[PDB]
Scaffold this active site. Sequence first.
Site, PDB file in Angstrom:
ATOM      1  N   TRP A 157     -62.516 -42.067   0.134  1.00 17.87           N
ATOM      2  CA  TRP A 157     -63.080 -40.787  -0.722  1.00 17.87           C
ATOM      3  C   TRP A 157     -63.779 -41.562  -1.781  1.00 17.87           C
ATOM      4  O   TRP A 157     -64.872 -41.182  -1.931  1.00 17.87           O
ATOM      5  CB  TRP A 157     -61.711 -40.073  -1.520  1.00 17.87           C
ATOM      6  CG  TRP A 157     -62.196 -39.206  -2.394  1.00 17.87           C
ATOM      7  CD1 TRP A 157     -62.541 -37.835  -2.233  1.00 17.87           C
ATOM      8  CD2 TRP A 157     -62.310 -39.363  -3.906  1.00 17.87           C
ATOM      9  NE1 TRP A 157     -62.900 -37.310  -3.236  1.00 17.87           N
ATOM     10  CE2 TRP A 157     -62.980 -38.223  -4.477  1.00 17.87           C
ATOM     11  CE3 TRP A 157     -62.385 -40.372  -4.803  1.00 17.87           C
ATOM     12  CZ2 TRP A 157     -63.273 -38.200  -5.747  1.00 17.87           C
ATOM     13  CZ3 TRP A 157     -62.649 -40.526  -6.008  1.00 17.87           C
ATOM     14  CH2 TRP A 157     -63.286 -39.201  -6.493  1.00 17.87           C
TER      15      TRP A 157
ATOM     16  N   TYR B 165     -67.704 -41.117  -2.953  1.00 20.40           N
ATOM     17  CA  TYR B 165     -67.977 -40.738  -4.357  1.00 20.40           C
ATOM     18  C   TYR B 165     -68.919 -41.894  -4.802  1.00 20.40           C
ATOM     19  O   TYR B 165     -69.693 -41.635  -5.520  1.00 20.40           O
ATOM     20  CB  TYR B 165     -66.713 -40.576  -5.273  1.00 20.40           C
ATOM     21  CG  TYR B 165     -67.271 -39.846  -6.334  1.00 20.40           C
ATOM     22  CD1 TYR B 165     -67.972 -38.472  -6.241  1.00 20.40           C
ATOM     23  CD2 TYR B 165     -66.704 -40.335  -7.510  1.00 20.40           C
ATOM     24  CE1 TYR B 165     -68.169 -37.925  -7.607  1.00 20.40           C
ATOM     25  CE2 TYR B 165     -67.120 -39.709  -8.634  1.00 20.40           C
ATOM     26  CZ  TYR B 165     -68.109 -38.554  -8.716  1.00 20.40           C
ATOM     27  OH  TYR B 165     -68.100 -37.981  -9.875  1.00 20.40           O
TER      28      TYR B 165
ATOM     29  N   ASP C 148     -62.342 -34.723  -0.340  1.00 20.86           N
ATOM     30  CA  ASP C 148     -62.150 -34.247  -1.659  1.00 20.86           C
ATOM     31  C   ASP C 148     -61.487 -32.947  -1.765  1.00 20.86           C
ATOM     32  O   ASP C 148     -61.383 -31.859  -0.804  1.00 20.86           O
ATOM     33  CB  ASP C 148     -63.770 -33.560  -2.191  1.00 20.86           C
ATOM     34  CG  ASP C 148     -63.630 -33.044  -3.680  1.00 20.86           C
ATOM     35  OD1 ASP C 148     -63.435 -33.946  -4.575  1.00 20.86           O
ATOM     36  OD2 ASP C 148     -63.554 -31.842  -3.742  1.00 20.86           O
TER      37      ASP C 148
END
Lengths: 282, 282, 282, 282
Positions: D218, D222, D238
């Site tokens: 994740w 990001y 997410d």
Amino acid sequence: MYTLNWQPPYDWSWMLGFLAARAVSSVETVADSYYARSLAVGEYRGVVTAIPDIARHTLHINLSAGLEPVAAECLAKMSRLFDLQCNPQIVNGALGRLGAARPGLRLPGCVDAFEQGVRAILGQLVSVAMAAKLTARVAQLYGERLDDFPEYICFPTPQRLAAADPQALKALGMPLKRAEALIHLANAALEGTLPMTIPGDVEQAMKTLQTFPGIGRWTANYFALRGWQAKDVFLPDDYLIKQRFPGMTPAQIRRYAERWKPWRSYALLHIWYTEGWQPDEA
Amino acid sequence: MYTLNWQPPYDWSWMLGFLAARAVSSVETVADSYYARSLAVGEYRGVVTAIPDIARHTLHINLSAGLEPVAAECLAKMSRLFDLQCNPQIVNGALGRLGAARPGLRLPGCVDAFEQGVRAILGQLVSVAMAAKLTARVAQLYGERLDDFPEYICFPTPQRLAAADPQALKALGMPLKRAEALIHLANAALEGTLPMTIPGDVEQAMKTLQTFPGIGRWTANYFALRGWQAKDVFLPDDYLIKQRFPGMTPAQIRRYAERWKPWRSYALLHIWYTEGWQPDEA
Amino acid sequence: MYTLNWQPPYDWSWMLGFLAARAVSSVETVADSYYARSLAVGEYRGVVTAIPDIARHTLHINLSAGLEPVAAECLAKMSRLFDLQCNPQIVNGALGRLGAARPGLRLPGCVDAFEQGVRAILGQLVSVAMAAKLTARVAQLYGERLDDFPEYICFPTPQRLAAADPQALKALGMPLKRAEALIHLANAALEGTLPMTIPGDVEQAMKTLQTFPGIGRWTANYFALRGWQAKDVFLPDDYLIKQRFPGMTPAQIRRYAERWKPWRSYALLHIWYTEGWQPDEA
Amino acid sequence: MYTLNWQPPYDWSWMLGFLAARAVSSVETVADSYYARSLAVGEYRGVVTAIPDIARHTLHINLSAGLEPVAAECLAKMSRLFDLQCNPQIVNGALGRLGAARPGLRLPGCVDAFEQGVRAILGQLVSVAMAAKLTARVAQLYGERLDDFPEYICFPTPQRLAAADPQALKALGMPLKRAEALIHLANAALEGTLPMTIPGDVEQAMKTLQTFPGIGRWTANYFALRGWQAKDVFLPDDYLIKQRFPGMTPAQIRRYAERWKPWRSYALLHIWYTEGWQPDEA
DNA sequence: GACATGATGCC
DNA sequence: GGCATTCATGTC
DNA sequence: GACATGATGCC
DNA sequence: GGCATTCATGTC
């Protein structure tokens, strides 16, 4: 000639039978009353003949002159192969009925860990008879023949397979990977990264092996068992074991089989040979 | 009461002598007519006793019943310790003069490569007697005494030494680093990183070894020699060797030693145990 | 069509001359009054033109249409190439007489840290003249041409060199290992393990670069100096430098330079371009 | 003072709105018509201010006197922070429906990869609000308050955070692992292991990032998004994305999204900002 | 079978 | 969300 | 003796 | 120049 003692009972038919289902064309010779094969110990070589004496629970070993200078090591190899050390009723005592059917069951070891390593790899996916045919082809091509005994051929050495070419091996009838795994193994041998003897911490030792290319947890567990004669290792990912514990996931088989600690290698062999063994109907 | 062959001549005096000086109390006994020590093969334990028979060109070996299940490997360990394979008529024919005076020379091996590793380390920068007392301590503190023979004690296995306190070790007389090195070594021995048998490529094996904390080229070479019993090693970094080759550097020595390949290990022994020796002018 | 000013003095005849000897055919154009080159920022392509306005200590940057969506980045590259941040006062005050000769001396950086990486490695051994030739050959084989400016070719991306054939690069006039280095550098760039911007700990950064195949201490320093425009690095093991310090071993020279922290990079420059210069044998 | 171009349309309200919600006290300031924050480039510090000019399709940027020496790089950082390079016709055209209602959508970048990494980490598991105050506390502690404008403090440097006591941060309000994560990220940064710029193989760089403790897929994603402004990443892990794709495992979401490349980063945004959005049933 | 990839809980 | 571990897939 | 550091040839 | 290897040298 040389003689070694073992403790009764000793199922030689079972042992000789087992070894015979995997004997390799021109490297081994198995009969109802003796086992015979080529053997190398450094530059020294010849043939080793082992003849059991059911009567005196003794094992006679004959070495050709070429092996005499290393007689002792030869004897050690044989004892490891045959599991003479085994105290049948210490083992059986902890395996209850699982072994009661054949208390003379011994752990078939090997006469060389590297070889056993090669053997356990070619045994991937295929049948016992095929892995035999296969190993023979690899032997036929890379193995050095005996001057003294033409009929015989020495198992391929580490440095002969290390220099081998993947395509050549592949040609013998194995996937490109399998071949590379063999070429890797031989290098770890020359470099001494592959334990030729049962290490103190078997698990850790095995983990290290699984990082090797082509060597999964099955290849590692089986090698531990044959190449090192590890006695407390089970095989939850084995074809048969799966088919012997129908309906169970690898961690229940392992979690189940942990009742035979510390002799799981023996419990495994018993399950392999108990024709219709289904987990305890409880 | 087993028995093993050897090709003559065989300087038994020289061998035992060499083993006596480095003998570790409680662990080994060395009389001028026999050698005996505590031995452990896995979980089997007892006491070995070799008695050279010059008449027969034979080495007699009796075994403590606690080691009978593993007699074969035991006999193998002794043969490695005494260099029973050596065909002196070949080695000496090769070195010519250097070995003319002590044709019965043999390479003193070891009973276990791990033990010999520990011994090598504890042999760093100290007298023989010194080290054989330091070691004797270690064997006293981390050794498995025998019940069958309380008088003897088994060399510390890697598991007993792997989980040892550096200070605990240091306190018996050795830099902390030295105690640390044994701890490391002990680990590689649990995960099969320490080659327990002569590898195919002994140069590579040694190079690797050198990355081990507490191990330098001298220790690597001496390990390869006694631990693996590698026959073509030389110690150009040794104390006495520097003396035998005055004003010569490791490199100079090393290549002068090249004249004895493939038996540089024997050459070494002959030079070491030959006071007043000196290189030629060619 | 764009302006970026600078603090005086600024020796432009020196900046351009430097960028001229090292100028790569078909990628750079260097004259007495301007600098021009192909430039790519990802998928954005085009030519950059730099025109110094000495009178008003401002640099005039023009950008081909294709690079306008990334003008800021181009400007930043241009400014790192020309060391416009430099404060002649601080460096010259800190350096003293050493730079009294050329106070306009600036630290010539680059436009792309990867490119510079490929230059540094190529700038190995051969002369500056040879290097530019060799580099240009690589650009010709792997560079992207520009439609709007057919005379220009973009410098090769990591994506093309990572996929390069070492034998192909070899045939351009460089040892195999040297080409294997370019490829590695290229791959490093792909996974992001090649610092494209001056790293917090220049020292540690450089130590890590030396772990790269093909990069030694010299290349790792020259890279830091030109690629990250690190200001406090020195080349004690450089050729010419060795001459500037006759009889001094890298460590000596290097201990000497400490007197220049933290503007050692600038120091190096002056000493390099001050033919007479000699240390103070005190 | 300075002016940068941008292609229309540009949804300024949305953009400034997004930065606002994540604005860090004493570091940033976000207002209806402008954006301001501290900024240090090496030893050059000051305040940057960005004021969009809808009329002239341009971004005006003023820098405090402290940053003028490194102004061009400040402009580039701003161009990365506001995605000025973006050509709406291209992205939207390719994106179709998805970006039809809000065609001025942009990729909120960052002005420093490191800082961004920090943010990605601190923004884990908590709400945008938590992260903001969380981060704020970090900045007020290891930051460098500006003299010229005391209400502003430069986001902490790697050297600073690398040397922070992991328990001090734990105090600010974060698990001990979330804290060691920062200490680690900061060390990587000190030595160049943290790509401060978009890599060639973004996939391989993210794979590598996940080896970093405290960094998962994740965060790694990001991070590629805001830190490297990679335009083709999606966040199938997410919390919100999973909601926008109800009853679809990460691998499923992931495959559906393949229909928006090479602009999966934009698609993500669009989707993120659309309540009743849901994939086409067919 | 090796091996890469996709599908609970804990803290 | 990172992270560990155990099934369950699916080429080769 | 291990082991940092510095200070000759083969690519 | 990278790089592997060698000859002092000081230390613990």
